[PDB]
Design a protein around this ligand. Structure first.
Ligand SMILES: [Pt+2]
Ligand SMILES: [Pt+2]
Ligand SMILES: [Pt+2]
Length: 128
């Protein structure tokens, strides 16, 4: 599924991301936009043997188990394929774990580069 901006904002708000650990909702919309272009099926296979999966491009070395990645810790306790669903719940739940395990949103390259220091509220402005 390729979400619209306001659609995805509403789904993320229903799953409690607004002000999660002090990150406003527009941060999370912005991260997904520059990670995956709001595409739930996005994958990126890296040269190091890990793969990034889904709308927040969660990586298989630390967070999910794909059976193909050396070193994997599976800290979100999920198969990586569960992050390729049209339903964002698994991605959201895992992201919450990523930010809590002492990581900020700096964990996401795209957030650090394309969202940090910008007006992220633009990404939800005009939505209901
Ligand atoms: Pt939902
Ligand atoms: Pt829901
Ligand atoms: Pt949820």
């Amino acid at each position: 599924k390729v979400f619209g901006r306001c659609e995805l904002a509403a789904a993320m708000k229903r799953h409690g991301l607004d002000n999660y650990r002090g990150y406003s909702l527009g941060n999370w919309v912005c991260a997904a936009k520059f990670e995956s272009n709001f595409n739930t099926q996005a994958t990126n296979r890296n040269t190091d043997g890990s793969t990034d999966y889904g709308i927040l491009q969660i990586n298989s070395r630390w967070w999910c188990n794909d059976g193909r990645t050396p070193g994997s810790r599976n800290l979100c306790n999920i198969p990586c394929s569960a992050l390729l669903s049209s339903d964002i719940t698994a991605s959201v739940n895992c992201a919450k774990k990523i930010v809590s395990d002492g990581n900020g949103m700096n964990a996401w390259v795209a957030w650090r580069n394309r969202c940090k220091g910008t007006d992220v509220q633009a990404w939800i402005r005009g939505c209901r």
